[PDB]
């Protein structure tokens, strides 16, 4: 079985959430590849199937549990299991379609959605943009329930899509970015639920580009600046990896490190 990390929203604290995100990062990366102090996820090329996924078992105060599957190559959610049913996002290619056959192999009912898990598509289905979907422990608690009840007709598709958006940001994006982990820690600390501000949204949108810019940099210096947003929506440019070391925790593999 793939590695399993457990988290519950029931009585969650800053520390329990922090322990969780740190454990997820530890199972996503091996320590083999660290560039400018930033870990790089395993290269998909040649990655054995037995090392391809990790599992995040989420429980809530309602005593419901679901298990998300994350791809180690990008830290993103590929599907989930609840009881006797499992659901997978539409795969991008045949290799990924084959790979997900190795997940939740004893589940009685397996389904693949016709839609992918990218935000553009999930927002369309949810009927809301990320800027209008609240995040926090309550939202996560609710998301777990919604995912749990999908197979029995209890959850409408827009609510399912919204629930994925919540889970992906609070787990995948938090694993990818200390900054986003921090944003979720704050919501937990004060029991606040609020939508992500522009700084969070723009970081999420830029993860792939930041990964490439860092890995292809000249001694850390970007050939082309990357524009991000502040919390108030104002734009600024990033010219160097240095300022991102406290912000980005994981990068997708883009190229081999230079000699």
């Amino acid at each position: 079985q793939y590695p399993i990390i457990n988290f519950t929203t029931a009585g969650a604290t800053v520390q329990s959430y922090t322990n969780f995100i740190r454990a997820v990062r530890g199972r996503l990366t091996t320590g083999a590849d660290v560039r400018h102090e930033i870990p790089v996820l395993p290269n998909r090329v040649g990655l054995p199937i037995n090392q391809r996924f990790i599992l995040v078992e989420l429980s809530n105060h309602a005593e419901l549990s679901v298990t998300l599957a994350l791809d180690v190559t990008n830290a993103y959610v590929v599907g989930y299991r609840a009881g006797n049913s499992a659901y997978f996002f539409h795969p991008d290619n045949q290799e990924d379609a084959e790979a997900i056959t190795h997940l939740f192999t004893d589940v009685q009912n397996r389904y693949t959605f016709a839609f992918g898990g990218n935000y553009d598509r999930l927002e369309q289905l949810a009927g809301n943009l990320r800027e209008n979907i609240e995040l926090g422990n309550g939202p996560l608690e609710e998301a777990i329930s919604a995912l749990y009840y999908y197979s029995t007709g209890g959850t409408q598709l827009p609510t399912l899509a919204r629930s994925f958006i919540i889970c992906i940001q609070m787990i995948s994006e938090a694993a990818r970015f200390q900054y986003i982990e921090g944003e979720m820690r704050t919501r937990i600390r004060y029991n606040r639920r609020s939508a992500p501000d522009p700084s969070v949204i723009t970081l999420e949108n830029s993860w792939g580009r930041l990964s490439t810019a860092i890995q292809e940099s000249n001694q850390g210096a970007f050939a082309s600046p990357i524009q991000l947003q502040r919390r108030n929506g104002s734009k600024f440019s990033v010219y160097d990896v240095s300022i991102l070391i406290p912000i980005i925790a994981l990068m997708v593999y883009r190229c081999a490190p230079p000699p």
Partner: peptide
């Protein structure tokens, strides 16, 4: 080092 975004 999050002051970057404030």
């Amino acid at each position: 080092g999050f002051g970057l975004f404030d």
